Design a protein around this ligand. Structure first.
Ligand SMILES: Cn1c(=O)n([C@@H]2O[C@H](COP(=O)(O)CP(=O)(O)O)[C@@H](O)[C@H]2O)cc/c1=N\OCc1ccc(Cl)cc1
Ligand SMILES: Cn1c(=O)n([C@@H]2O[C@H](COP(=O)(O)CP(=O)(O)O)[C@@H](O)[C@H]2O)cc/c1=N\OCc1ccc(Cl)cc1
Ligand SMILES: [Ca+2]
Ligand SMILES: [Ca+2]
Ligand SMILES: [Zn+2]
Ligand SMILES: [Zn+2]
Ligand SMILES: [Zn+2]
Ligand SMILES: [Zn+2]
Lengths: 516, 516
């Protein structure tokens, strides 16, 4: 029995074709992605493949202005237009709250949204009951296929799902549902969830009954061949997990931002045992044309958004590297911009130091043609919308924060820190906690202001975002050890006023972060 | 026969008491200098010493707004008020031109102005004839003392004396005049000039007849004891030059900016042979009170100047080190300010590089109380009033300019270069031309903007002042090798607009310049 699984994940409201760095498209001839382009390939596959399922493995919220304006409707309207079959809940579908998901998406969505490890209790459970399900049986061909959904068990520590929700462990919540499914004689079972390729490998091996594992949340790219763009692949597509019951479970994931459409052809038998499965992510590039019906429908909406973009801000002469591939591994100039901007707005209401988690930086801004910046640009960088809080810290506290900046370096980890007024040097041939080999911090009260070796028993004032000030990302030493805490100024607003003040900005890799 | 020589040099219109760094006074209790304070000590000495001469060895022009407003009158009126006996011409007395000296100073001055190596020829010689003399015989006590004047033989390459003047070699022009003096039976002979302690040591030994050598132009500080302030002394006061005719000629010089009054008691005999001479510069500090008659007369004028100062510009939170002691030896933050400001004003009309001769930086700005900056401040930094010209240069050309930046490092040399967008590392345990051990220059067209090793056969665009663009200070390779030259914007004006744009600036020693 043939079954073709089309799957997306981590679109982040990039329903509009984007530059290769998944940021606002500048030259359509090179641009790729978008719901419109995705439509023409799904449509094409459905033309030739009688048995098909289209599934998104979470994270359609946030990313671009398309969300912070329609705050959900854009996802529901165009996921329905693309006629998705199922979707597992992601962590970003709670960034606007439990009500910021129930009213816009769950109610207006024409298809099931799945998650098995999310238990609802209290006054809220009354109605959200049945607005999402732990699974769903889908009739394909003359057979049936069962999807079981899961979400990250760290969403209440990554998003805003309120307190009337509980996020259980995925495996311990999926297996009871999967047993239920096979006692209903639904052998063909797909696991679709938002926990991360590493946790998806835990489910594939340690859940009996699962036939496929489709997932996301870590923006992982798998390929069997020669990759088509700048994303270097982790493993082959599908990756094969040798489960504990003696089975070859395919693990699949297609990068992010709607740049690739996952495609997995699966051959079953009567008892629903996966004989084999070949596939590969499909780069939705310029060769695949936008579908006019969708493309125009997109511009029916873009008209509303144009008001935020058509307003001028300032100019940039160099490319602003806000890419996760550089802002979580080395000194990216986007962070240096944000940190230099940070220490300008406070100077009107005596600090010189700045730390910033590269994970907060969510989009690059491609300097092009005239090198002009807009709110649509700055918004894609900082979708969270917080403030830059002033914090009094011990030197010992800052020392360990930078040991936390590289404590698990190498896994695209978002807690890697950008700097301003700080010179840090790492040596990764040392065990976590000995990696910082030099740290010279800029002093101001000194008569010769300059970078000097950090003293452990000294008081420094650093400006960092609210999310760090409260010990996010695992910086619990900051939240607990700080000597004072002051309120900040809206994050995107002040960076907008800064670059408007400058009128031209050229941040560079100045050697703030170095490696030994 | 007793004769007390009081001498000043390199006041640079600092007739107003100044902070210890010779910049605008902030707390009078600590402030020192000024014509008023100088008056009460000269007056005191004349009360007790029957035979005295007061002489300035050049450089009363420029330095502060007092000049760029009254452009000479302030010097004439208060040098007369201090009742100077003679003065040798300095190089800065031509910064406003030959007419910018004849009308304000030479005509209105009630005393002789001396220089022997300045020959006047052409249409100008007609009147400037006799407005200054090569020497003068002064009656002191019941005897006579002869002063011979000299100026730097590099003034037409340091100032603007026009083309109708000629600056001869000092020695070859002094000795003929000194012979004339001793054939007139004026044995007591003082040499007063503006060429530099090193050239004054040439005159003392190689001019027969000279009894004393009083000079300046290098702002040298000599002391016999324990110095009273931050200036570390070169030698003892007086320094003794063992002349070629077998004589102990005293070489004297008192720092600068009116901070010390030189004081040299000299014992002669009938034939006018210097038996001995003891003395020491007198720190005109707060203990010596301002003379009310002068102090008030100073405020009679300050009223006119207040208009430039009482206008706001911006703020600074850190001390701006514009001191020659740091801006000609290492990375001073005043230069980094000027270079960062330089690459902001051009960005409105694509460069990132900046070189700047520390000699152009002529005053620090002391961040105090509220850390507010004014035109009176910015003017004292850049008395020259030029522009910041854009220049296209080869990489090989920039390489040798930095070898010229330290080619004779160690002598308070003004051709030492400040940077912006450049990382230079020197190693002075190498012969001039091998001292640059590393140079990484910031690139912008590169997709990862950052500092990269300078390529010799590559084209870079640096912004530097007009004085450098025309190969000043010995940078003749720049003037000759550049590939293009563009006009600049007024130097002080744009730095004012910058810091006004910033509203707070905190330049620091970031490690642009380093030493191995
Ligand atoms: C600011 N912030 C953040 O920078 N992060 C960064 O994202 C990283 C995770 O990103 P990822 O690895 O790409 C997975 P994704 O979050 O895109 O699903 C973390 O490491 C951290 O650096 C996470 C949460 C977070 N804030 O969470 C609270 C919050 C959520 C939504 C809204 Cl509208 C307002 C406040
Ligand atoms: C700009 N400039 C300069 O920076 N310098 C710097 O001064 C240094 C000499 O200073 P110093 O050793 O302290 C003796 P002083 O000139 O104070 O008598 C040089 O090395 C050089 O870096 C010299 C000449 C110079 N410009 O000379 C042309 C000029 C003169 C007056 C006016 Cl109003 C306009 C244009
Ligand atoms: Ca099965
Ligand atoms: Ca004699
Ligand atoms: Zn994501
Ligand atoms: Zn996610
Ligand atoms: Zn001088
Ligand atoms: Zn001079």
């Amino acid at each position: 029995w043939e079954l073709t699984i089309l799957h997306t994940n981590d679109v982040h409201s990039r329903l509009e074709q984007t530059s290769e760095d998944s940021s606002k498209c500048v030259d359509a001839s090179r641009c790729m992605g978008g719901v419109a382009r995705l439509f023409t390939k799904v449509q094409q596959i459905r033309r030739a493949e009688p048995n098909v399922l289209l599934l998104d493995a979470g994270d359609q919220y946030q990313g671009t202005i398309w969300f912070t304006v329609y705050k959900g409707a854009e996802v529901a309207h165009f996921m329905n237009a693309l006629r998705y079959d199922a979707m597992a809940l992601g962590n970003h579908e709670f960034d606007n709250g439990v009500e910021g998901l129930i009213e816009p998406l769950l109610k207006e969505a024409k298809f099931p949204i799945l998650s098995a490890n999310i238990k609802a209790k209290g006054p809220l459970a009354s109605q959200i009951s049945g607005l999402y399900l732990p699974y769903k049986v889908l009739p394909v061909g003359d057979e049936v296929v069962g999807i079981v959904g899961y979400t990250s068990k760290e969403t209440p520590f990554l998003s805003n799902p309120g307190t009337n929700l509980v996020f259980e462990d995925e495996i311990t919540a999926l297996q009871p549902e999967v047993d239920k499914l096979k006692t209903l004689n639904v052998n063909k079972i797909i696991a679709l969830g938002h926990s991360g390729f590493e946790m998806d490998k835990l489910i594939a091996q340690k859940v009996r009954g699962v036939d496929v594992v489709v997932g996301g949340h870590s923006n992982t790219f798998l390929y069997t061949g020669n990759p088509p763009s700048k994303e270097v692949p982790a493993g082959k597509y599908p990756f094969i997990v040798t489960s504990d019951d003696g089975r070859k479970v395919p693990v699949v994931q297609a990068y992010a931002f709607g740049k690739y459409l996952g495609y997995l052809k699966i051959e079953f038998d009567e008892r629903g045992n996966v004989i084999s499965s070949h596939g590969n992510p499909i780069l939705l590039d310029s060769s695949i044309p936008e579908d006019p019906s969708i493309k125009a429908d997109i511009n029916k909406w873009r008209i509303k958004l144009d008001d935020y973009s058509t307003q001028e801000l300032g100019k940039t002469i160099v490319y602003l590297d806000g890419s996760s591939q550089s802002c979580r591994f080395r000194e990216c100039n986007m962070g240096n911009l944000i940190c230099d901007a940070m220490i300008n707005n406070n100077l009107r209401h005596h600090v010189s130091m700045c730390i910033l988690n590269g994970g907060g930086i969510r989009s690059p801004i491609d300097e092009r043609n005239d090198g002009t910046i807009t709110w649509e640009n700055l918004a894609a960088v900082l979708p969270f919308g917080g403030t830059f809080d002033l914090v009094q810290l011990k030197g010992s506290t800052l020392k360990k924060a930078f040991e936390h900046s590289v404590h698990r370096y190498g896994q695209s980890t978002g807690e890697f820190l950008q700097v301003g007024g700080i010179h840090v040097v790492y040596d990764l041939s040392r065990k976590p906690g000995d990696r910082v080999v030099k740290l010279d911090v800029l002093c101001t009260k000194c008569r010769v202001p300059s970078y000097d070796p950090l003293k452990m028993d000294e008081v420094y004032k650093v400006i960092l975002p609210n999310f760090l000030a409260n010990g996010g990302d695992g910086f619990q030493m900051i939240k607990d050890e700080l000597l004072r805490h002051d309120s900040g100024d809206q994050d995107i607003n002040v960076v907008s006023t800064y670059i408007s003040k400058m009128k031209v900005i050229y941040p560079a890799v100045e050697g703030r972060i170095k490696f030994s």
